[PDB]
Write a protein that binds this ligand. Structure first.
Ligand SMILES: CCCCCCCCCCCCCCCCCC(=O)O
Length: 195
C-alpha cells in the first residue's frame, strides 16, 4: 500500500531476525565459472557451501571466506567483505548500504522491469562507513521475503557476481558443533583471490 523501499526492507530484516537457518540450492559465478552446490546459512552470519561439480568447500564466519581445496590438502582465505563491520548479510545491508527500488515498487521479472513475481532492491554503499570490495547489491525477493537472486557488483569493476538461490527451506537444523566457520590455523591468507 504505497510501501517505500525502506519499509519493505524493514519487513525483510525483521523476518530474517527470527530464522535460525536456511538451506538452498545455490548457483554462483566466480572467476568466469559457474559453481553449483548447496548453501547452509546459520543466522545471523555463518555459512558453508558444499559444491556438486568439485570437492571444494566454501565457509564463512561473517569476516573471512575460506575455500578448502582437498585435492591439495590446504585452504585459502580472504576477507568476505573488506571494509565491512560484518555481522551477516542482513546486518551489513541494513547498516552499510542505502536501499532503493531497483526499478519500481511493483512486481517484476527477475531480469527486466516487465511484470513478474519479484520485488527488486538496490543496496548502495554508504561510503562514510568506509569503502568495501562490493559497492552495490541488487537483490530480488519472492513474495514471502525469500531471496531469489543476489547480484554483487565489485568495486573493482570486475564481472558481477550473480548468486541464484532456489529450493529455499528455513530451519532445517544445523547442530552448533557440526561446523567450524573461521579459517583453520593451517589456512593461507590471500588478499582477494575471488572477487
Ligand atoms: C544468504 C546468501 C549469501 C551467500 C553468498 C556466498 C556466495 C559466494 C561468493 C561471495 C561473494 C558475495 C559476498 C557477500 C557478503 C555477505 C555478507 C555475509 O553473509 O556475512
Amino acid at each position: 500500500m504505497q510501501i517505500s523501499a525502506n519499509q519493505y526492507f524493514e519487513g525483510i530484516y525483521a523476518k530474517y531476525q527470527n530464522i535460525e537457518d536456511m538451506q538452498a540450492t545455490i548457483n554462483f559465478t566466480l572467476k568466469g565459472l559457474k559453481q553449483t552446490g548447496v548453501l547452509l546459512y546459520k543466522f545471523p552470519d555463518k555459512f558453508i557451501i558444499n559444491l556438486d561439480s568439485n570437492n571444494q568447500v566454501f565457509v564463512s564466519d561473517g569476516e573471512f571466506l575460506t575455500v578448502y581445496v582437498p585435492s591439495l590438502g590446504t585452504s585459502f582465505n580472504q576477507q568476505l567483505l573488506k571494509g565491512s563491520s560484518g555481522g551477516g548479510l542482513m546486518k551489513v545491508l541494513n547498516s552499510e548500504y542505502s536501499v532503493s527500488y531497483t526499478n519500481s515498487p511493483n512486481l517484476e521479472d527477475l531480469d527486466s522491469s516487465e511484470p513478474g513475481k519479484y520485488i527488486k532492491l538496490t543496496f548502495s554503499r554508504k561510503l562514510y562507513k568506509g569503502a568495501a570490495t562490493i559497492n552495490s547489491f541488487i537483490i530480488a525477493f519472492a513474495p514471502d521475503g525469500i531471496i531469489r537472486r543476489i547480484t554483487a557488483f565489485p568495486t573493482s569493476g570486475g564481472r558481477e557476481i550473480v548468486i541464484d538461490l532456489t529450493a529455499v527451506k528455513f530451519n532445517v537444523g544445523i547442530l552448533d558443533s557440526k561446523f567450524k566457520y573461521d579459517p583453520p590455523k593451517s589456512s593461507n591468507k590471500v588478499d582477494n583471490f575471488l572477487y
